[PDB]
């Protein structure tokens with residue numbers, strides 16, 4: 001059908017965090033995961049649409065930290081909300097972007113934000129150019145929020161939040177399609193020298 005768009009998750013992997021080699025300074029970023037992308041977070045309708053994605057984080061917000069991702073193309077630091085993994089001492093920060101690399105990494109630092117097009121954060125009538133899918137890039141860094149013991153620690157799989165699909169086509173907008181944004185759990189290692 002014209003509006004038969006379907007959601008798919010976008011996921012990033014804890015297992016790509018390098019060994020954390022250690023400072024008693026909190027908060028601090030202790031490494032970046034490998035960024036991921038999904039071109040087809042929303043896909044399937046037969047009629048092209050102007051679309052945008054609104055991201056809402058749903059983990060507890062501990063506080064803020066200034067950071068500049070080594071990945072992405074931002075040249076200055078921004079404020080990021082630190083979200084709780086649930087594991088003591090460990091939080092994460094999030095950036096998201098449109099699928100295509102020219103679009104900017106958008107720091108997640110408010111209760112909800114448009115990740116693409118970023119213009120929609122100040123223009124409520126702005127959408128992506130018409131096409132048959134909506135995708136995104138996902139970036140995550142781990143944050144030490146307190147003292148970390150030496151050795152391995154397990155991070156559970158966490159749902160970081162969801163993307164809501166919006167459109168200027170009412171029938172599509174009204175479906176309120178949502179896609180999960182996931183942190184795949186895994187093992188990290190701390191080496192305290």
Ligand SMILES: C[C@@H]1O[C@H](O)[C@@H](O)[C@H](O)[C@@H]1O
Pocket residue numbers: 038039040098099100128131132133134135136
């Ligand atoms: C062609 C489509 O362009 C859109 O802007 C993107 O959101 C989709 O991922 C897809 O690449």
Ligand SMILES: [Cl-]
Pocket residue numbers: 009010011036037038
């Ligand atoms: Cl994915």
Ligand SMILES: [Cl-]
Pocket residue numbers: 013016034036
């Ligand atoms: Cl990966």
Ligand SMILES: [Cl-]
Pocket residue numbers: 037038039040
């Ligand atoms: Cl893809």
Ligand SMILES: [Cl-]
Pocket residue numbers: 067068069072074076077078095105
């Ligand atoms: Cl950044």
Ligand SMILES: [Cl-]
Pocket residue numbers: 157158159160
């Ligand atoms: Cl969760």
Ligand SMILES: [Cl-]
Pocket residue numbers: 168169170171
């Ligand atoms: Cl309409």
